[PDB]
Structure formats: structure tokens, C-alpha cells
């Protein structure tokens with residue numbers, strides 16, 4: 001079924017996350033955390049207070065796919081056992097210092113070929129696959145993109161709904 005999923009996405013906000021490598025997305029799936037650059041960190045903290053759900057939709061660069069989507073369960077927090085992110089060039093551990101907790105909604109992939117009919121009004125109506133890390137996706141486009149993912153039958157949204 002999709003009814004609880006649609007309830008979680010109701011009036012949600014959506015942000016595109018572009019990860020430079022697969023390792024960090026795998027780590028996020030295993031540990032339920034994400035970290036971003038300070039400019040996007042501030043944006044996500046503001047959104048977390050503003051909406052019933054904030055959804056991160058993940059895409060590893062050069063993969064041609066999205067790798068899933070997750071809901072923020074907290075604002076960013078510092079002061080913890082360092083998440084062993086794989087850092088690309090120019091990326092330092094301090095720039096990824098804020099850790100958001102997230103609850104995965106779908107850990108299944110979706111190829112960009114299946115989202116070619118969705119454009120994002122907040123990025124000049126370019127295909128939704130196009131955008132830098134942190135690009136906000138307008139409500140209707142983000143809802144339809146999330147609904148395109150294959151169902152993840154390993155997940156129970158009952159606990160997510162009560163976090164709302």
C-alpha cells in the first residue's frame with residue numbers, strides 16, 4: 001500500500017542531496033544520519049522547523065540514479081563520534097560536522113530515465129534529476145518523484161507518522 005506514504009509526504013518539503021560517492025550514502029542507510037555543507041546545513045535546519053516532514057532525496061553523482069529518500073528526524077547536532085565519511089577533494093571533516101538524524105522511507109534506487117517527465121519549478125523547470133546539492137524541489141514534483149520509487153517493503157512508516 002501507499003496510503004501511509006502519501007500521508008507522510010503531505011505538505012512535506014523536499015531537498016535534492018548530491019553525494020560525490022556511494023560510500024557515504026551507504027553509511028547513511030546503515031546509520032540513519034546525514035551531513036552536508038554549512039550552507040545547506042542552515043537551510044535544512046530552517047525547513048525542519050517549518051514543515052511536518054522534510055524529505056531528502058539522494059543521488060550519487062555519475063550514477064544516473066537516485067538511491068532512495070529519507071525524512072529528517074532532527075536538526076543538525078555536533079559533538080559526536082566522527083562519522084567516517086569518505087571525503088572528496090576539497091571536502092574536510094569540519095565542513096560535514098553537523099549530523100542530522102534521518103528515518104529512511106525508501107532505500108531502493110530509481111533511474112533518472114524514469115523521472116524524465118518531472119521538472120522542478122524551483123530550478124527553472126529543468127528535469128528534477130538536475131540540481132546542485134541542497135536544491136529544493138517543489139511540493140508536487142517532489143511528491144510525484146517519491147511516488148515513482150519502487151515500494152520498500154522492509155520499512156514500516158507507523159513510527160515515522162508518530163514522529164510527525
Ligand SMILES: CNc1nc(Cl)nc2c1ncn2C
Pocket residue numbers: 018019020021024034035036037085086087088096133
Ligand atoms: C556526507 N555528506 C556528503 N558526502 C559526499 Cl561524497 N558529497 C557531499 C556530501 N554533502 C554534499 N556533497 C557534495
